[PDB]
Design a protein around this ligand. Structure first.
Ligand SMILES: Nc1ncnc2c1ncn2[C@H]1C[C@H](O)[C@@H](COP(=O)(O)OP(=O)(O)OP(=O)(O)O)O1
Ligand SMILES: [Ca+2]
Ligand SMILES: [Ca+2]
Ligand SMILES: [Mg+2]
Length: 341
DNA sequence: GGCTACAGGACTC
DNA sequence: TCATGAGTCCTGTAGCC
């Protein structure tokens, strides 16, 4: 199998540049403003000019400003990036029926039946990169390999605006040499646990007793890492169907006063239902983030779809449960719907 | 023993 | 006054057959 993975470069930032060319060259920072105070919030992403200096997704907007006070700070415009994204995705569909849209800026394409080898695949990659650039003037990075994980790793190594192929021989080299921390699905917490077991490379998971690896990172991640180490990983490119829709908002000030929290919860429900658009959920979860930034939640599944009215009344009972069971103050409140009909 | 629902954990974008 | 927001998969625990 030959998988071609596409990942758009510094996406939210690059779209803003396409919409306003005068931005190219300067450091651009797309922000998610929370509204508590002046500049409260975090960075969604920033173009590479800004990243060279440490301004990247996740950091406080206030910190980014300390580092780059004169950078251009723009409020995130999700809807816009989504429309642009949707158009690029349709361009990729012309290259394969077997395509998996993994997120707002990623797609995996099974081009096994389109090309005969990696040479042809690489060339197909260029053709794709050019098409997208001509049609939308958006640069993306292409990753090509025997499966989804290594096609992704291939792209991570070639961005931005790149294209890389990881052939069978290189797959064997990477299992031996690639920092296991760079393996998709291995975050700091797991990486740390693995470093503690002397596990720094995929191949190392082969010499450690399974029960020990399992007991440390869990059965699923253990089998996953091992399957990759044995070069026996296979995951099909499948159309993804959204399983849940939700909205969570930050409150002006922390609280655990039901009436003060209600308006935020209701706003979150309103927006969620708008997003649901025709999908009827059978399950609802109220999600709260406490002052100490811990996430707590309570949910319920019904034997029938949940009407907006039922969502309101039930969300209150669920929040109440949270309040009655947790003494901390709430910082962010929201809701999430699932188990669609 | 293992399925199911619920809540928390971890990861990725 | 650091600390967004969205969505997915896995696991521990307890009920139940
Ligand atoms: N922590 C986050 N919070 C909010 N939005 C985020 C977060 N991480 C990523 N995003 C958004 C910003 C990006 O434009 C988009 C895709 O992520 P990702 O590929 O990892 O960043 P990027 O497109 O800016 O990529 P790159 O490093 O690939 O050039 O999703
Ligand atoms: Ca990207
Ligand atoms: Ca990692
Ligand atoms: Mg990516």
């Amino acid at each position: 199998m030959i998988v071609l993975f596409v990942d758009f470069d510094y996406f939210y930032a690059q779209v803003e540049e396409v919409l306003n060319p005068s931005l190219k060259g300067k450091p651009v920072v797309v922000c998610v403003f929370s509204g508590r105070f002046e500049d409260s919030g975090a960075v969604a992403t920033a173009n590479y000019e800004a990243r060279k200096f440490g301004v990247k997704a996740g950091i406080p907007i206030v910190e980014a400003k300390k580092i780059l006070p004169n950078a251009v700070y723009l409020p995130m415009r999700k809807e816009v990036y989504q429309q642009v994204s949707s158009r690029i995705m349709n361009l990729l569909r012309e290259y394969s029926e077997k395509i998996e849209i993994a997120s707002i800026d990623e797609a995996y394409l099974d081009i096994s039946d389109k090309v005969r080898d990696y040479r042809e695949a690489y060339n197909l990659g260029l053709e794709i990169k050019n098409k997208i650039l001509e049609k939308e003037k958006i640069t993306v990075t292409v990753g090509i390999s025997k499966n989804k994980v290594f096609a992704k790793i291939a792209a991570d190594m070639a961005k931005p605006n790149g294209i890389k192929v990881i052939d069978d021989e290189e797959v064997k080299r990477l299992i031996r040499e690639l920092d296991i921390a760079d393996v998709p699905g291995i975050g700091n917490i797991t990486a740390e646990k693995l470093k503690k077991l002397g596990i720094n490379k995929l191949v190392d998971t082969l010499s450690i007793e399974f029960d020990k690896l399992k007991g440390m990172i869990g059965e699923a991640k253990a089998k996953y890492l091992i399957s990759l180490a044995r070069d026996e990983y296979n995951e099909p490119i499948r159309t993804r169907v959204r399983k849940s829709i939700g909205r969570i908002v930050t409150m002006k000030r922390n609280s655990r006063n039901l009436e003060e929290i209600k308006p935020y919860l209701f706003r979150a429900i309103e927006e969620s239902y708008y997003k649901l658009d025709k999908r009827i959920p059978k399950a609802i979860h109220v999600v709260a983030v406490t002052e100490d930034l811990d996430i707590v939640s309570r949910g319920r599944t019904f034997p029938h779809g949940i009407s907006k009215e039922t969502a309101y009344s039930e969300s209150v009972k669920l929040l109440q449960k949270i309040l009655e069971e947790d003494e901390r103050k709430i910082r962010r409140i929201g809701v999430r719907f699932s188990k669609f009909i």
